[PDB]
Subunit: 153 residues, 2 copies
């Protein structure tokens, strides 16, 4: 199938991405994990997202996401992601093409234990994927929670 | 890696499942689509789930959904899903080991315009995985939309 015009200005994003990342929150200490993000499409104005985490040494698998990225010309964007942890997010926000980012905040965080707002950012910096999740809980403001870097497979 | 004990009762599901479906609804007459379904896992208390529909001759892509099941040892199962429509569900239910069945019913369908409810039902009927989808809208009660019957691959 061929790139739909909506999906085509995020065509760099496309393919397997793979490196490792680093979590830390006021509640907990630096811990490190490998990552694997895949962006795809089959003609439609929607980009599939899957992701998986895994322990470095083992490295037995940790967490795992699967989603739909749904871009539009006016530079705005919507994104729904399910997590094995048992959340679902519907994130609204924008993509600029010069910089080659996407910037989301949560709109609806669904079946959330203590989770409030969650903001994901995927930018291409220096030809690698820089992906960050900021978090808020019932006790702590939005802040940098994770930060992963990834390379083109 | 080993089938979490919490998950072991549902092992009939693990693997890829090909078939066809059909929609009828009061506003859309009969139709028919190709359709795959695969459940996997990864040594967690979770079965991963992906599903994609095509056009029978084309078979050009139609829709994908993905997510995650959490069975409990108590009967309850709680599912999450993101759909290429651009729409998430929370599903919560109660499965069944020798009726071999997983009945679900939306506890939250985010990012919907006009959907109000969705249930799903995943069940083995004489060897093939039958999938029944039902929906209510602003204007329609909780009735059938999608039926599909899939053969283990
Ligand atoms: Ba423009
Ligand atoms: Ba940049
Ligand atoms: Ba029991
Ligand atoms: Ba049965």
């Amino acid at each position: 199938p061929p790139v739909h015009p909506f999906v085509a200005p995020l065509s760099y994003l496309l393919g397997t991405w793979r490196g490792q990342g680093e979590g830390e929150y006021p509640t907990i200490p630096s811990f490190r994990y490998g990552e694997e993000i895949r962006f795809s499409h089959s003609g439609k104005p929607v980009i599939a997202y899957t992701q998986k985490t895994w322990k470095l040494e083992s490295g037995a698998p940790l967490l795992a996401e699967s989603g739909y990225f749904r871009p539009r010309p006016d530079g705005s964007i919507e994104v729904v992601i399910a997590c094995s942890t048992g959340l679902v997010e519907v994130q609204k926000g924008t993509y600029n093409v010069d910089e080659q980012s996407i910037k989301l905040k949560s709109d609806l965080v669904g079946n959330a234990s203590k989770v409030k707002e969650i903001s994901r950012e995927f930018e291409l910096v220096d030809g690698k994927l820089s992906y960050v999740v900021r978090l808020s809980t019932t006790t702590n403001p939005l802040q940098p929670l994770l930060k992963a870097i990834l390379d083109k497979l």
